[PDB]
Amino acid sequence: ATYAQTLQNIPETNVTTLDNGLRVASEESSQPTCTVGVWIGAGSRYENEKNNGAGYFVEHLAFKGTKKRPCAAFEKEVESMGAHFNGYTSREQTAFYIKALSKDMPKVVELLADVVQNCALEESQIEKERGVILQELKEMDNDMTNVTFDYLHATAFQGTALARTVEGTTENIKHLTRADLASYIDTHFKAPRMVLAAAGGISHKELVDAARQHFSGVSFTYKEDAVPILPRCRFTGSEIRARDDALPVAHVALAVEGPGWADPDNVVLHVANAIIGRYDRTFGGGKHLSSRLAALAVEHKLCHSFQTFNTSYSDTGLFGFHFVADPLSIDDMMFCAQGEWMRLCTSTTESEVKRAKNHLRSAMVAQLDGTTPVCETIGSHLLNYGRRISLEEWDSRISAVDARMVRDVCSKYIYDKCPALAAVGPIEQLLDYNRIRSGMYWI
C-alpha cells in the first residue's frame, strides 16, 4: 500500500463558516480521544507599545475561570472529565485547545466558547498573575535561546511591532489594567479572526452544530466582519551584541528576511534548510552525519549544537540559523555556517535535495502525529494559508523542488543580503558586522 496512496486516503479536512465569521474545521479520525480548540489570529504583533504583553497576561487568565463558572467551578468541571486544557500566544497567533474524549466533543466547544468570550478577569486574580508573569520573565531570561531569538527580532525588525517580545515589558506587566486586558479581548478575540478546529473521532456536523450554539457572535456593521491588515514590518540588516563573558557558552543567530506564509518559495526554503539540517552533541550519527556543517561541527568541535530555521509570518519572516558554541570556536563555526549558506546558493547538488526532500516529508508527517498536532495544523493553515494544505499537496510541491530551484531561491533570499545578527554571552571571538557581511557572497 505505497506511501503515495496512504496520502490520498487521509480523510479530507472539512470547513464551514458561520454568519458571525467564525470558521469551523476538522479532520475526522476513528480516534476515541480527540483535540479541539480555537486558533485566534492575534498576538504581540497586534499589541502596540502601551499594551505589549496583553495577549500574554490574558493567556494567564483564560484558565482561571469565566463569568458563568468561576475558578474551581471551571477547573473542577474540566479536571474531573479527564480533559487537558492548555494554550499559547505567539507574536501573531494565539491558541486555546483541549484534549478530551471524542464523547465530550460538544461540551468542550461550550467550554472553549465560554473562555474566549466570558473570561472573568477577576481583578483579584489579575494582581496575582501579575506577579506570576513577572516571575516567569526572571526565568525565561535565563534561556539563552529565547533571549537570542527575541533579540534577533528586536534588531531584525527593529522599530516595528514584530520587534517586541510576546511576554511584553516589565513595565506593562506591572501596570496593565483589567480594562486593558478587557479591550484586548474585545478587539482581537473576534469571530472572523478565530478558527474552531478539531481532530479525532468527531462528526464535523456535530462539531459545527455545537459551534452554532455557543459561538453565536452577532455582526451588525461591516466593520465587525472585516479582518484588519497589519502595518508592514521593516527588516534591517543590523546586529545586537549582548555580551557577558560570564556565561558558559555563547549563542549566535543570523537571518535574512523571509517571504511569508503565502509564498511558495517557502517550500524550497524548507528543502534547503533540510540540507544544512541541524546538529547537537548527542546525535549518534557523528562524523558520518550527512549535513556538512554538522559533519564539520563534529570534526572540529565547532558547537554544542546548531539549527537552521524558516520562521514564517503573514507578510514577512526570518530565514536563518542559530548555534551555541564555546567562546573560542565561535568564529570557525560562523565561518563554516556561512560557508554552507554560500554553498546552498552556488553549488547545491541533486543528491542533496533528494535527501533533503525525503527528510522534509518525514518531518511534514511528524507534524501530524496526534489529534493535537493535526488540530494545530488546521487552526494554523486556515489562519495562515486560508485553507487546509494536505500532505498530498505539500508532497507534490516538495517533489517539484530540485537543485537548480534551491540555488535560485536561496540566492534570491541569501546572496549579498544584509543579515540580522544577535549574539549573546562570551562573544568576543565572533566579530565585526562587516566581516560577517562579506560572508554573504562568493562560495
Binding site: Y415, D416, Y441, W442
Partner: protein, 61 residues
C-alpha cells in the same frame, strides 16, 4: 533603474563585477586619455611642435 539594473547585472555576481571593471577601464582609458590630451593641447595652442610642424614638415624644398 540603473542602480538596480547595474547592481542586478554587474555588481552582484563577483565575476560580472570583475569583467565590468576590465571593460570599464578600457572605455574609461580611451575617454580619459583623449580628453586629457585635448585639455592640455588646448591650454597650449600654437606652442606645440604639433602646431608649429607644418611650417617645415614637407613645407619647403
Amino acid at each position: 533603474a540603473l542602480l538596480r539594473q547595474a547592481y542586478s547585472a554587474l555588481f552582484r555576481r563577483t565575476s560580472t563585477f570583475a569583467l565590468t571593471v576590465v571593460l570599464g577601464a578600457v572605455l574609461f582609458e580611451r575617454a580619459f586619455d583623449q580628453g586629457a590630451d585635448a585639455i592640455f593641447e588646448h591650454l597650449n595652442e600654437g606652442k606645440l611642435w604639433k602646431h608649429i610642424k607644418h611650417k617645415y614638415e614637407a613645407s619647403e624644398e
